A paper describes a structure:
Compounds containing stereocenters of unknown geometry are registered as a mixture in our database, whereas if their chirality is known they are registered as individual enantiomers/diastereomers. A gray zone contains compounds that are known to be pure enantiomers but for which the chirality of their stereocenters is not yet defined, for example in separated racemic mixtures for which it is not known which part is (S) and which part is (R). In such cases, the electron density is usually the deciding factor for final assignment of the correct enantiomer.
Residue numbers in the entry: -2 to 131
The structure:
Amino acid sequence: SHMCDAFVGTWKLVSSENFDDYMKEVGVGFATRKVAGMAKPNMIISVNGDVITIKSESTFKNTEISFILGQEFDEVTADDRKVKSTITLDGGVLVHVQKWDGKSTTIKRKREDDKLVVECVMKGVTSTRVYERA
Ligand SMILES: CCOC(=O)c1c(NC(=O)[C@H]2CCCC[C@H]2C(=O)O)sc(C(N)=O)c1C
């Protein structure tokens, strides 16, 4: 159904801005911030029917989520939070909200030119992570 076609593929992280501050706000501790911050994950996005799968593979961690748009699921994040996640499409942007411990963060993923741009926000702190095709 050509849902998410432009996101599908294998992507490599090529830049990150303000990620340490984002992680601090989320509650990531020092050692994990330092080692996570070094990671340059491959993000692999695929679609099969209504099910979207997003894998992230790096030297630090491999993560995988599979979901249906609009349908909440329990996610264990790379930093080991146990969150309730809901991912929707809003105007062509994948919007991923994570809830845990009365906290919330929002991750937006967009296609912009040949890049996939990820913006993540925790209170007033935004980080931008830019991926290119692998
Ligand atoms: C919050 C701490 O995150 C990490 O350290 C981190 C990942 N975070 C993400 O996949 C999301 C982070 C929030 C934005 C969306 C995502 C993005 O990075 O693009 S994957 C990963 C790995 N495979 O090793 C690590 C180490």
